[PDB]
Design an enzyme around this catalytic site. Structure first.
Site, mmCIF file in Angstrom:
data_model
loop_
_atom_site.group_PDB
_atom_site.id
_atom_site.type_symbol
_atom_site.label_atom_id
_atom_site.label_comp_id
_atom_site.label_asym_id
_atom_site.label_seq_id
_atom_site.Cartn_x
_atom_site.Cartn_y
_atom_site.Cartn_z
ATOM 1 C CB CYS A 61 -0.889 0.071 1.243
ATOM 2 S SG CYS A 61 -2.242 -1.167 1.222
ATOM 3 C CG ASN B 77 -0.345 -4.713 6.988
ATOM 4 O OD1 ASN B 77 -1.189 -4.540 7.870
ATOM 5 N ND2 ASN B 77 0.030 -5.932 6.564
HETATM 6 C C1 LIG Z 1 -1.097 -2.760 1.697
HETATM 7 C C2 LIG Z 1 -1.422 -2.625 3.103
HETATM 8 O O1 LIG Z 1 -0.863 -1.820 3.811
HETATM 9 C C3 LIG Z 1 -2.504 -3.545 3.549
HETATM 10 C C4 LIG Z 1 -3.284 -3.027 4.721
HETATM 11 C C5 LIG Z 1 -4.593 -3.801 4.966
HETATM 12 C C6 LIG Z 1 -4.172 -5.289 5.058
HETATM 13 C C7 LIG Z 1 -5.265 -3.252 6.215
HETATM 14 C C8 LIG Z 1 -5.519 -1.721 6.132
HETATM 15 C C9 LIG Z 1 -6.720 -1.383 7.035
HETATM 16 C C10 LIG Z 1 -7.003 -2.728 7.716
HETATM 17 C C11 LIG Z 1 -8.375 -2.915 8.402
HETATM 18 C C12 LIG Z 1 -8.634 -1.802 9.408
HETATM 19 C C13 LIG Z 1 -9.994 -2.036 10.113
HETATM 20 C C14 LIG Z 1 -10.076 -3.423 10.758
HETATM 21 C C15 LIG Z 1 -9.167 -3.506 11.998
HETATM 22 C C16 LIG Z 1 -9.214 -4.882 12.626
HETATM 23 O O2 LIG Z 1 -8.257 -4.866 13.754
HETATM 24 S S1 LIG Z 1 -8.696 -5.528 15.140
HETATM 25 O O3 LIG Z 1 -9.814 -4.764 15.632
HETATM 26 O O4 LIG Z 1 -7.470 -5.496 15.903
HETATM 27 O O5 LIG Z 1 -9.156 -6.888 14.904
HETATM 28 C C17 LIG Z 1 -8.812 -5.989 11.665
HETATM 29 C C18 LIG Z 1 -9.763 -5.956 10.474
HETATM 30 C C19 LIG Z 1 -9.795 -4.576 9.748
HETATM 31 C C20 LIG Z 1 -10.895 -4.621 8.667
HETATM 32 C C21 LIG Z 1 -8.417 -4.302 9.074
HETATM 33 C C22 LIG Z 1 -8.002 -5.418 8.102
HETATM 34 C C23 LIG Z 1 -6.654 -5.157 7.425
HETATM 35 C C24 LIG Z 1 -6.652 -3.813 6.676
HETATM 36 C C25 LIG Z 1 -7.595 -3.828 5.458
#
Ligand SMILES: *CC(=O)CC[C@@H](C)[C@H]1CC[C@H]2[C@@H]3CC[C@@H]4C[C@H](OS(=O)(=O)O)CC[C@]4(C)[C@H]3CC[C@]12C
Ligand SMILES: *CC(=O)CC[C@@H](C)[C@H]1CC[C@H]2[C@@H]3CC[C@@H]4C[C@H](OS(=O)(=O)O)CC[C@]4(C)[C@H]3CC[C@]12C
Ligand SMILES: [Cl-]
Ligand SMILES: [Mg+2]
Ligand SMILES: [Mg+2]
Ligand SMILES: [Mg+2]
Ligand SMILES: [Mg+2]
Ligand SMILES: [Mg+2]
Lengths: 320, 318
Positions: B1, B80
């Site tokens: 990202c 991330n």
């Molecule tokens: C290319 C990248 O940097 C990829 C980032 C991607 C995998 C992330 C970016 C935002 C994340 C979501 C943010 C909202 C929630 C947070 C949850 O955290 S928890 O409460 O500790 O469980 C996990 C799920 C989720 C939907 C994140 C998932 C990963 C992301 C899409």
């Protein structure tokens, strides 16, 4: 400019290019039908054997194609080659004398496969015979492709050269053999993910994806785009649907595109990808988008009078 | 990202990002209105002061934003950061305890400027308090921007750090100070066209454009995307219309996008740019395209009740 050729494993051709420049040319999709009366300076294009669709302009009731494909699955794109291109100054008796401006029209209107146009090229002379004096005389080289393979045509001070383009890409100068040798400078570039390296006593793990892609250049220079396009195009997984293959063209060419501000020409103006165009033999459709609008537009040869008698400058399109 | 922040010189904010991953998250455009009853585990988000629009998912009637902007021109994206992110394991009494999942909601719902959120961050503890058990706990860092400037927030084993993001970009690991120092390894990269070099007695002329951009890396590795984005973004000429600024976002992020086959993750799957999203404060609109379709779609906050009481998961768009 960068061009690519690929297939879907089922006999269908995709050939696509970026048109990189400091301004737009006013180009449109032009259909050349089988009943069009040709205007071929040395008779190389005596009649239209295969209908043609592609991007270009019309001057002197003649289609001047930047890139085009035909109704038999053969396509061609012309890319800049100044400093290296040097056409013959006059036609040669007994040769197939092709004016440079009509070279893509010759390829697509006469032949149905790379085998056929390769055989014809054995006798070809490409002549510096301008369509008119409105633009500087062209200095081009070409990529030609069908569903099986691509060739590159370069006409230089020592004549005609035809190359087996076994990486299915083309950029600008220098000549094709130079770029092909240059690929040997990137033998450690790979998409693979390494789990752990030990350097001396340091345990080194990747930050993330791309750790062995290091070395692929990101700049806009012609040899750099050739290397970068050859890597991305070689590693893109083959696709079997029209939609995934259209998406493959635009993503691959976005990886070597030019955006505002990043590289100037001698004028000081920035070179940018003005359009990206794709010919698909599976659907006999020309797809494109532009710097100002990434949505894909298309023109199907089936919507136009491809058996008619007049060049068609297409004014209407699908999907935007 | 990769994420970017810029303005049009007229007080309008643009903040945009690529979501690069081996699969689609099922994200949607989510509007959080000012009347929504919050579900904030430690009281950090007691009410919605500014309506929010962005891309994310909803779980437990809570908006989980990937990136979002608000009705006052402040926006934020989470990217991330595993290996480096390390949140507090428990809330700290007397602190502003923000659950990591709600960190973008906290930024966008409470504050109207980077000045305001930077002041509030002096009090913040980010807590590992998962929304539920469905996903692995997030490990993120964030870029926050308004029309004036961007900051980067990284919460590590050294605590909360706020960086002045004077190149207006963010990628993944390692930390922001590392990437900022790495910029100093590309000081000869330039868009300029040189007419003629003489090396010894050789007259050297460029093949064409880009001869002094040599050295900018083209690979997908996080530090490489940071450098490449920093270069493209720094040199992109400023634009004064909405159409040109929308175009600027998608072109800049296509320069650092990921396409099929070019870089695998440990699973062996290829990382790809699944969507590219842009928040514009000028039109209070979220724009995006996807791997499967480059046409730009949009949702305007004004088409939804920004002062309603329910999260809006948008289906109808332009
Ligand atoms: C290319 C990248 O940097 C990829 C980032 C991607 C995998 C992330 C970016 C935002 C994340 C979501 C943010 C909202 C929630 C947070 C949850 O955290 S928890 O409460 O500790 O469980 C996990 C799920 C989720 C939907 C994140 C998932 C990963 C992301 C899409
Ligand atoms: C990025 C690049 O490689 C740039 C290539 C671009 C500038 C070229 C590609 C195709 C060219 C046109 C081809 C048809 C005619 C040919 C005329 O040559 S002449 O007959 O010798 O006069 C010149 C005009 C035109 C329209 C070419 C213009 C340059 C191209 C668009
Ligand atoms: Cl200069
Ligand atoms: Mg145009
Ligand atoms: Mg990563
Ligand atoms: Mg998707
Ligand atoms: Mg309550
Ligand atoms: Mg009100």
């Amino acid at each position: 400019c960068t061009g690519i050729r690929y297939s879907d494993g089922s006999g269908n051709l995709y050939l696509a290019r970026n048109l990189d420049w400091t301004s737009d040319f006013g180009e449109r999709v032009v259909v050349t039908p089988t009943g069009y009366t040709t205007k071929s300076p040395f008779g190389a294009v005596p009649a239209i054997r295969h209908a043609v669709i592609g991007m270009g302009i019309v001057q002197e009731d003649t289609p001047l194609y930047f890139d085009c494909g035909n109704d038999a699955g053969l396509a061609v794109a012309g890319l800049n080659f100044p400093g290296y291109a040097q056409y013959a100054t006059e036609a040669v008796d007994g040769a197939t004398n092709v004016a440079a401006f009509e070279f893509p029209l010759w390829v697509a209107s006469q032949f149905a496969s790379v085998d056929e146009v390769e055989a014809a090229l054995a006798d070809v002379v490409i002549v510096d015979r301008p369509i008119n004096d409105k633009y500087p005389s062209s200095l081009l080289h070409w990529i030609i492709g069908d569903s099986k393979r691509a060739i590159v045509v370069e006409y230089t001070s020592d004549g005609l050269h035809v190359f087996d383009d076994d990486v299915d890409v083309l950029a600008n100068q220098p000549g094709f053999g130079w770029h092909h040798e240059n690929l040997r400078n990137y033998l450690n570039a790979s998409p693979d993910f390494p789990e752990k390296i030990v350097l001396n006593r340091a345990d080194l793990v990747p930050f993330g994806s791309g750790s062995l892609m290091r070395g692929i250049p990101g700049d806009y220079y012609s040899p750099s785009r050739f290397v970068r396009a050859a890597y991305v195009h070689a590693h893109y997984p083959g696709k079997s649907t029209e939609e995934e293959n259209v998406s493959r063209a635009f993503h691959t060419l976005q990886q070597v595109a030019m955006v505002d501000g990043s590289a100037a020409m001698g004028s000081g103006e920035f070179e940018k990808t003005t359009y990206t165009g794709l010919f698909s033999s599976r659907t006999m459709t020309y797809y494109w988008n532009t710097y100002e609008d990434p949505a894909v537009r298309s023109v199907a040869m089936a919507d136009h009078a491809a058996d008619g008698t007049e060049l068609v400058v297409v004014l209407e399109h699908h999907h935007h």
